[PDB]
RNA sequence: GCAAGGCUAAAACUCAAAGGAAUUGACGGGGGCCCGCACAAGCGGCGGAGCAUGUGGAUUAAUUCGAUGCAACGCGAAGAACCUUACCUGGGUUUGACAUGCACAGGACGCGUCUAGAGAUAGGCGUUCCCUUGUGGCCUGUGUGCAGGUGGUGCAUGGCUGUCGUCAGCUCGUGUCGUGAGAUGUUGGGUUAAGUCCCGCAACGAGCGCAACCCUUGUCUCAUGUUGCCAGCACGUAAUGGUGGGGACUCGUGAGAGACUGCCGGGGUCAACUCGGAGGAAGGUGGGGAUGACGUCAAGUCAUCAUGCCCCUUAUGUCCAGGGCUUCACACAUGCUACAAUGGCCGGUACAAAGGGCUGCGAUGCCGCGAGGUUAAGCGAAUCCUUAAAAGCCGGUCUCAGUUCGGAUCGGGGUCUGCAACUCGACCCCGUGAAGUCGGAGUCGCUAGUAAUCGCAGAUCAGCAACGCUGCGGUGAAUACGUUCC
C-alpha cells in the first residue's frame, strides 16, 4: 500500500467508524485476520517461516 | 488463497490448538503456595490461579 | 469400469411383507433420502390393492412383474455409416430391475391425484395385463423382433 | 512455485517454532512487536551473517535470541554496539530486554548461512557455477551431511533471459517427513536486480 | 516423325542454399497392450422463467486496476453507503501524511471558540522541559540533499501460484557400442495403483519421483475423573446428576496394541504375484487428508511485498467534501427460488456434529403481531449464553386450479447499525400477487455413507453471508453387461 494511507489507517480517523484494519506487516487493506492483524499472504509466510506460535498447517 | 492473485481454488489450511488440563485442587496450605508461587515454568504453557 | 465387475449390494427383507421384491420397490420410489415416505407410499399401494382384489398383494405384485419383464433389448451400436439396433438377450435381475422401473416411471404420469392410488392402480393394471407399463414390454418385444436380422 | 516450504512442512513433527509464548488476547500486538523487532535486527545486521531469531516472551519480560557464525560484530567494540542494539529493542518495546548472541558451530553445514554466503559472492559478482560448487563442496566436508541441493535463479551474471540452474550432492528426500532438511533462502541484491538462492541441507532423519 | 512429339541443347535473371544418410523428439483419420464418471448402465441437473453475483459490450465526469480456451467470468475482493479507493468534479497544500544529512531560530504540543462542505484558518489560554548557559530532546521557518508515486515495463526480475498431473516418469556416475549427434542401463517375459517387484540380458550402481514415516476416522488395553458420566447406595428438590457419592458405562486426552499376504487351500520358474478361505473392528493402499519429480505454457501477478531500467516533482505527490466503482436497447457464465399433492398451510412432538463469545454472549422477567426495546443472573467458558436443528413422526385441511402453487414487482408503516441508509444497508408488518404448468440445438456432476435432499457454524464484519466461500452433521439411493464408439 501507500505509505500516506498506511499513516492514515495507523492514525485516529473523524468518525470513529472510518476505522480500518491493515496488515501489520505489508499494509494490505483485504483479507485481515483480527487475531494476527497480517493479510493471507503474510499469514501464510509467518506460518511456514514458524514464527507464529501454535500455527500449523491442518490435516483431518 | 494460496497465491497472490485471482487463483481461488487452491487453498491451505492452518489450526492453532490448546491445551488444557491440571485443574487440580490443592490445599491452600501458606507452605505450599509458597512453591507455588517461587517456582516458575516455561512461557510455552500459561498458568492461572483460580 | 474397466477392472471387471463391481460388489453389488445386498438388501434385506421388508419386515411386514417378508419379500426382496417390495424392498426394491421402495428403493426404486425412494427420492431425496425420504425412504420412509417412500415406504408408506408403497405399503399404501399395496394395501390399496389387497382392499380391492382380494388376492394377496405381494402375489398380485409378482404377477404385475412377470407381465412386465422383457426378455430382449434393442442395445444401438454404430458399424459403417450408419447405425442400426441390436437385439439382445436380457439378464434376470436386469429384466426385474427395468420392469421395477417402468411401473414407477409410467405410475408417477399416470391421470390420478395422490402417488398411492396411481401406483396401485398401474400395479393391478400391469397384472391385468393393460397397463402402459405391459404397452412399454410389448413394444420393446416388437422393436427386438423387427431387427432379428442383425443378431451378429 | 510447485514446492512446499520445508520448514513448514515439518513444523510441528521435527523442525519447532522460533517464537514461545502463550497470549490469548495479546496476540496481534505481540506479532506487531516481533515483526518490528525482525525488522530492526536484518537491518545492519547483513555483515554479521544472522542465521536465525528466536524470539522469547515471559509474563511482561522478553527474551531475544540470536545466532550467527560472528558473535563480536554483533557485541561490537567490546559490549557497546549489543548495548545499542539492546537499547534500540529497548526503545521499541517498552518491556526490559534480554539480548543473547550465543554461536553458530558449522557456518558451511547450516543453510541461511550457506545462501547468505553464496549471494554475498553473487553480489560481488564471481561466478555463480563457481560459488554453487565451493559452497556444495564446504557443506559436504562436514560431520553429518547426507546431502546438499542449492539452487540459484533469475538474471545470473547479466543476461537478458533469467534462468535457473541447481546442483546436487548426495541425497535431498524433500517429501520425507521423518527426514531433517534444513532450508535456507535468500536474494542477491546485483546490480541488475535480485537473484534468488536456495538451499536444501538433509542432515539424516532424525535423532 | 503423318501427327503426338523425340534427339542435340543455351542464356539472361534469381537464391545461399538445394541435397544424402542417420539421431532425439513430436505427431498420424498407423499397430499392440493398459487406464480414467471417457463412454456404456443409472440418478440428478444446466440451456427456457424470476432474482443474486461476475464478465463482455454500451454508456458516463468517472463507471479505478488486474484476470480472458481447458487453466478468465460468486476470480484478486474472508464484506465498495463515508472510510476502503487506487477514479471523476471542485476546494487546498507542496521538503510535504511519513525518514534521515547539511546549514538558523526557539517551544513543541494540548484545550476551547468562531469561519468553513471539510481540508484548513484565525480569537484566547495552559507551556521553552531538559540547565535552547554549551552539549541533549523537540519544533518551526528558510532552504538544500530528499521523501513520495496502486506511474510504465510480469517479454528485464526475485518471491509466490496455476497447469499438464498426484500423471509415472525424469536423470546421473563408472563401464561398453558408435567418426558423430547419441545409445545401453530405462529393452524382452511376467506383475502391480506405481520405473512396484521378480526372471533374463554389456551392463553394474545411484538420485529426484512411487510407496513409507505425519494428521484424521474405524477396534481394543492401560493411565485418568472435573466444569465430563451415573451403574450400585443415599438425596430425589423440580426430577434440571439437582446433591452427597461412586470408578461401573460413555466421554474427554495421554501412552500403547492391532493389518504385515501374517495363517490355510489352489495357481504361478518353487519368483514376483494372483483367486478363494480362516481368524479378526477392520484384508490386501481399510476410508480420507497433507504431500506436486525433471520440466512446459516468454501461463498469472511491478495492485501483497521486493526490485533493475524508464518517467512525474506547484504534481502522475499529498489533504478534504460530494459523486462513481451499484449505469443498461443487449449478450455470456456461475448460482438460488420455483413451476407443486413424494406437495402447500395449521396444530402437537423426537433425534446432531462442529464451532463463537468482555469494545462480547445476553439466561430470566416485562412491553411489542413482529423485526425488536428495557432490566439483568451467569460466563474469558466440558461448568453461562449461543441452543429452538430442519427434513422426520402423528393429526387436520386443501383436491389439481396459474391454485391456499410461485413470490418477483410495487404502495404504506416500521426496527437496528451507523455522524450519516437519496444515489446505495439488512430485517419486520399490512397490502399487491408478475413470469413460470419441467424447459430447442446442446451440455454438466456423480461409483457409497457417494449422488440427491435438510438444516447448523465460522472468517471478513458497526451493519450488510438463511443465494458466495470454508466447514459440520441428519436422511439416504439407482446402476456398472462391458471396452465397439466419443
Ligand atoms: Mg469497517
Ligand atoms: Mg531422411
Ligand atoms: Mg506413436
Ligand atoms: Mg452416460
Ligand atoms: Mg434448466
Ligand atoms: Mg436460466
Ligand atoms: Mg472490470
Ligand atoms: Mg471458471
Ligand atoms: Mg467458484
Ligand atoms: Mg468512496
Ligand atoms: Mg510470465
Ligand atoms: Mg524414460
Ligand atoms: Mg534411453
Ligand atoms: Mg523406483
Ligand atoms: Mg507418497
Ligand atoms: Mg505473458
Ligand atoms: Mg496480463
Ligand atoms: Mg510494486
Ligand atoms: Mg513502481
Ligand atoms: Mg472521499
Ligand atoms: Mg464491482
Ligand atoms: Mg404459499
Ligand atoms: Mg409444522
Ligand atoms: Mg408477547
Ligand atoms: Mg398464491
Ligand atoms: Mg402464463
Ligand atoms: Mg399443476
Ligand atoms: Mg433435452
Ligand atoms: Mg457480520
Ligand atoms: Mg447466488
Ligand atoms: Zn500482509
Redesign the pocket.
Given at each position: 500500500?501507500?505509505?500516506?494511507?498506511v499513516?492514515?489507517?495507523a492514525?485516529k480517523?473523524?468518525?470513529?467508524?472510518?476505522a480500518?484494519?491493515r496488515?501489520s506487516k505489508?499494509?494490505?487493506?483485504?483479507?485481515?485476520?483480527?487475531?494476527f492483524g497480517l493479510?493471507?499472504?503474510?499469514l501464510r509466510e509467518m506460518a511456514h517461516a514458524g514464527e507464529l506460535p501454535g500455527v500449523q498447517?491442518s490435516?483431518? | 488463497?494460496?497465491?497472490?492473485?485471482?487463483?481461488?481454488?487452491?487453498?491451505?489450511?492452518f489450526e492453532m490448538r490448546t491445551?488444557?488440563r491440571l485443574?487440580d485442587?490443592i490445599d491452600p496450605t501458606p507452605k505450599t503456595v509458597d512453591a507455588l508461587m517461587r517456582i516458575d515454568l516455561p512461557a510455552s504453557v500459561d498458568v492461572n490461579i483460580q | 469400469?474397466?477392472?471387471?465387475?463391481?460388489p453389488?449390494?445386498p438388501?434385506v427383507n421388508d419386515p411386514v411383507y417378508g419379500s426382496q421384491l417390495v424392498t426394491?420397490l421402495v428403493?426404486?420410489?425412494?427420492?431425496?433420502?425420504?425412504?420412509?415416505?417412500?415406504e408408506?407410499?408403497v405399503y399404501g399401494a399395496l394395501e390399496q390393492a389387497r382392499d380391492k382384489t382380494g388376492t394377496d398383494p405381494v402375489i398380485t405384485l409378482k404377477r404385475a412383474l412377470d407381465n412386465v419383464k422383457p426378455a430382449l433389448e434393442v442395445?444401438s451400436?454404430?458399424v459403417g455409416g450408419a447405425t442400426y439396433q441390436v437385439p439382445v438377450e436380457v439378464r434376470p435381475?436386469?429384466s426385474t430391475?427395468?420392469a421395477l422401473?417402468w411401473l414407477?416411471?409410467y405410475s408417477?404420469q399416470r391421470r390420478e391425484?395422490?402417488?398411492?392410488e396411481?401406483l396401485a392402480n398401474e400395479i393391478l393394471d400391469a397384472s391385468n395385463g393393460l397397463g402402459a407399463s405391459v404397452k412399454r414390454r410389448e413394444d420393446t418385444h416388437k422393436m427386438a423382433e423387427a431387427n432379428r436380422a442383425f443378431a451378429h | 512455485?510447485?514446492?512446499?516450504?520445508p520448514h513448514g512442512?515439518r513444523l510441528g513433527?521435527t523442525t519447532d517454532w522460533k517464537s514461545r509464548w502463550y497470549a490469548?488476547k495479546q496476540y496481534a500486538e505481540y506479532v506487531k512487536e516481533d515483526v518490528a523487532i525482525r525488522r530492526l535486527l536484518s537491518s545492519g545486521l547483513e555483515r554479521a551473517g544472522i542465521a536465525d531469531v528466536e524470539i522469547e516472551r515471559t509474563r511482561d519480560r522478553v527474551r531475544v535470541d540470536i545466532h550467527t557464525a560472528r558473535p563480536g560484530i554483533v557485541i561490537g567494540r567490546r559490549g557497546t554496539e549489543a548495548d545499542r542494539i539492546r537499547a534500540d529493542l529497548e526503545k521499541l518495546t517498552g518491556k526490559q530486554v534480554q539480548l543473547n548472541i550465543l554461536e553458530v558451530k558449522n557456518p558451511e553445514s547450516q543453510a541461511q548461512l550457506v545462501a547468505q554466503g553464496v549471494a554475498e559472492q553473487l553480489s560481488n559478482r564471481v561466478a555463480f557455477r563457481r560459488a554453487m560448487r565451493k559452497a556444495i563442496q564446504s557443506a559436504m566436508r562436514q560431520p553429518n551431511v547426507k546431502?546438499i541441493r542449492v539452487?540459484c535463479?533469475?538474471?545470473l551474471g547479466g543476461a537478458?533471459?533469467?534462468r535457473?540452474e541447481?546442483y546436487?550432492e548426495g541425497?535431498?528426500?524433500?517429501?520425507?517427513?521423518?527426514?531433517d532438511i534444513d532450508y535456507g533462502?535468500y536474494?542477491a541484491k546485483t546490480?541488475?536486480?535480485?537473484?534468488?538462492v536456495?538451499v536444501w541441507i538433509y542432515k539424516g532423519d532424525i535423532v
Open positions: 500500500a501507500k505509505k500516506a494511507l499513516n492514515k489507517a492514525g480517523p473523524r468518525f470513529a467508524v472510518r480500518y484494519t496488515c505489508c499494509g494490505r487493506p483485504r483479507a485481515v485476520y483480527r487475531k493479510c493471507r499472504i503474510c498447517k490435516s483431518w | 488463497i494460496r497465491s497472490p492473485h485471482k487463483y481461488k481454488d487452491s487453498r491451505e489450511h491445551h488444557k485443574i485442587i | 469400469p474397466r477392472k471387471g465387475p463391481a453389488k449390494r438388501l426394491q428403493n426404486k420410489v425412494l427420492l431425496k433420502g425420504k425412504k420412509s415416505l417412500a408408506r407410499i442395445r451400436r454404430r435381475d436386469r430391475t427395468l422401473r414407477v416411471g408417477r391425484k395422490t402417488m398411492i396411481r | 512455485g510447485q514446492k512446499i516450504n512442512f513433527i490469548d546431502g539452487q535463479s533469475g538474471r537478458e533471459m533469467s535457473s541447481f546436487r541425497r535431498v528426500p524433500l517429501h520425507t517427513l521423518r527426514a533462502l536474494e546490480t541488475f536486480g535480485r537473484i534468488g536456495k
